Design a protein around this nucleic acid. Structure first.
Ligand SMILES: [Zn+2]
Ligand SMILES: [Zn+2]
Lengths: 118, 147, 371
RNA sequence: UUUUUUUUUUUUUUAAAAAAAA
RNA sequence: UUUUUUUUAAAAAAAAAAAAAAAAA
């Protein structure tokens, strides 16, 4: 089959800032203590750099990060085997209005529209 | 379906996504073109490759993945297809995707010699009730609240 | 020579494949003529930023310094040596390879401590382009580290003390450079050792050809990024390196890929049979790792009164699929892991006779357990 | 370069015990 | 009331030693 995924195309620099900020917020700070970072090897897909899983209640946002395409992003929304693609504005809204609080800090907060700067 | 169609005429990204965009294939650009067309024919005829379709705004790209890569054989998304026998000299792409609160089928055509083509979106009312879980109400409640 | 950071080079040039918390890519080059017996002309150590910037990388430092040197020096053939802490970067590799293709005189030898980003294709293709440009890239051993400490480290007379787990990481990194750079064994060593005419002269050192599949929901599909020949290391070349017998590096390199819970099999085209000091580790390894099955094709059965029968029995009983090398498997080993350059596979005298004789020996030794 | 641990001490706090002195 | 010894746990840095670093943890 030809299972369909949307992809936001972005260079290695912005994707590496995205990875740096998300692991800095899970591990160095305690803002994202409930977030998951599924590694590249746990993904059986050959074109996945990472799977940042953001548990939103009983649901879970998925930010899959890709390889060898530059690189690509894809945002899902999974709750009991039900997927839903999500544009970066809605993913930003769900992240900021479920997890974090409300200005520039030396680590900027993980925002998928700053990822998809273009 | 009615409020789904009302918000379907309300999304800001949908104005760009369903304006019959000029889709192009961004694959192996530095190589010859003829071999790009030939590789498009092999990729649309094989079972292990990906194909990417990019709009004019160089930000959004639909990518088709083989179902064995994820290792999940789901029966209900089976309507996605790459048609060549339907019409001569033109390849059709069909993909049912659940975008935000709505389930929309992406339909496009792309010439084998132009490698470019037309893409658009279309509501299909079957997937509104075929989703057994139907967490669109929960999605709605999550997306409307604001701190 | 101006020597920079005496002490930080111990855990900054650290032979360990995965090592985070770093900011500096180091580069410790030296320039020479075509004759290496002569003294070096100059040897300057450079320090380029890692993720900081691509324009101010150590490779760009070297590119700029070579430019400023060669406008003030005579143009001739140069044999430059590097010792870099990481592997080159995508942009750096794709510019350094252009710089090597621009001047045929300059010949690099990029020695790396750790490989930078070996698990994504965007870096792997860049490293393959750099290696195809004409720079022989080798993982640093003890001797290159001793050269780096002797030249480019402000030592106070103290000698180079190798850290713990240097040679295990050396073979763990060499067998993925050999798989990421499509390194293929020569035809000469293949027709020297892999042929199954019986041991009367030569053929002292065993070889390997591993191959990884996936067992997907449809069928088996091979991965192409885990394939190479993992020859067993020389036994204690100066005492400190561990001399690993029975392609120990394969079993030790098993977990290095971070194998998924997805079950599959790994093919091991060994040019011998796993000995008693190498098969019990295999049986334990296939015991505690249920997901990975390990199929084995052997050229010649190891028989030196080493009680190999019990090890082979407990290797087969746990779930390893041992067979013996026929012309199909020999053809695959010549087709995939040997740089045949287009030449077809040539057989020897008594291919099927020796194959069926050794397989009958395998039947008479393996299958007689419990009658 | 940094997190998680094991085993030993230097000085302090607290508690218990043995001995000597006023 | 003062002095010597042993022990139960902690604290500032140190040397003895290990594991995870999938890469600005
Ligand atoms: Zn670099
Ligand atoms: Zn052995």
């Amino acid at each position: 089959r030809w299972q369909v995924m949307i992809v936001w195309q972005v260079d290695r620099m912005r994707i590496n800032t995205w990875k740096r900020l998300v692991k800095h917020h899970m591990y160095i700070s305690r803002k994202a203590k409930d977030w998951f970072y599924r590694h590249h090897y746990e993904s059986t897909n050959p074109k996945i750099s990472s799977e940042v899983h953001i548990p939103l209640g009983d649901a879970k946002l998925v930010i899959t990060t890709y390889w060898g395409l530059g690189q690509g992003v894809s945002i899902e929304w999974r709750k009991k085997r039900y997927s839903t693609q999500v544009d970066p504005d809605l993913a930003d809204q769900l992240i900021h209005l479920h997890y974090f609080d409300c200005k520039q800090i030396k680590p900027p907060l993980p925002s998928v529209r700053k990822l998809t700067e273009d | 379906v009615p409020d789904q169609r009302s918000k379907f005429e309300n999304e800001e990204f949908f104005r760009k996504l369903s304006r019959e965009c000029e889709i192009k294939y961004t694959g192996f650009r530095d190589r010859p073109h003829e071999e790009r067309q030939a590789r498009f024919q092999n990729a649309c005829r094989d079972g292990r490759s990906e194909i990417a379709f990019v709009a004019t705004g160089t930000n959004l790209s639909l990518q088709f993945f083989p179902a064995s890569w994820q290792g999940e054989q789901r029966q209900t998304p089976s309507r996605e297809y790459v048609d060549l026998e339907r019409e001569a000299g033109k390849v059709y792409l069909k993909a049912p995707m659940i975008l935000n609160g709505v389930c929309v089928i992406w339909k496009g055509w792309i010439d084998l010699q132009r490698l470019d083509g037309m893409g658009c979106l279309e509501f299909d009312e079957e997937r509104a009730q075929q989703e057994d879980a139907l967490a669109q109400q929960a999605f709605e409640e999550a997306r409307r609240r604001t701190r | 020579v101006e020597p920079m950071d005496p002490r930080t080079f111990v855990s900054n040039f650290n032979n360990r494949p995965i090592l985070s918390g770093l900011d500096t890519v180091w580069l410790c080059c030296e320039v020479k003529t075509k004759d290496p017996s002569g003294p070096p002309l100059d040897a300057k150590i450079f320090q380029g930023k890692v993720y900081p910037k691509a324009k101010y990388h150590p490779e760009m430092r070297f590119l700029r310094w070579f430019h400023k040197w060669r406008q003030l020096h005579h143009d001739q053939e140069y044999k430059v040596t590097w010792y870099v802490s990481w592997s080159p970067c995508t942009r750096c590799a794709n510019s350094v390879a252009t710089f090597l293709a621009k001047d045929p005189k300059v010949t690099l030898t990029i020695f790396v401590a750790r490989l930078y980003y070996f698990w994504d294709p965007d870096y792997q293709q860049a490293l393959r382009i750099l290696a195809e440009a004409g720079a022989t890239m080798k993982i640093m051993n003890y001797n290159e580290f001793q050269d780096c400490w002797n030249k480019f480290v402000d030592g106070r007379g103290k000698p180079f003390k190798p850290w713990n787990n240097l040679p295990k990481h050396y073979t763990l990194l060499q067998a993925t450079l050999g798989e990421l750079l499509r390194h293929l064994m020569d035809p000469g060593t293949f027709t020297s050792n892999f042929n199954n005419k019986p041991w009367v002269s030569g053929q002292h050192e065993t070889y390997l050809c591993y191959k990884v599949e996936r067992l997907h929901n449809d069928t088996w599909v091979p991965l192409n990024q885990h394939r190479g020949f993992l020859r067993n290391q020389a036994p204690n070349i100066h005492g400190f390196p561990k001399g690993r017998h029975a392609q120990l590096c394969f079993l030790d390199l098993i977990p290095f890929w971070k194998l998924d819970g997805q079950q599959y099999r790994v093919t091991c085209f060994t040019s011998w049979s796993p000995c008693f000091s190498c098969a019990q580790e295999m049986a334990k390894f296939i015991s505690n790792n249920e997901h990975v099955s390990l199929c084995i094709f052997a050229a010649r059965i190891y028989d030196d009164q080493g009680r190999y029968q019990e090890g082979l029995r407990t290797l087969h009983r746990d779930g390893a699929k041992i067979a013996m090398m026929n012309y199909s498997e020999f053809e695959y080993c010549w087709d995939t892991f040997v740089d045949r350059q287009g030449r077809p596979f040539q057989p020897w005298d008594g291919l099927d006779e020796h194959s069926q004789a050794l397989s009958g020996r395998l039947r008479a030794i393996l299958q007689n357990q419990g009658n």
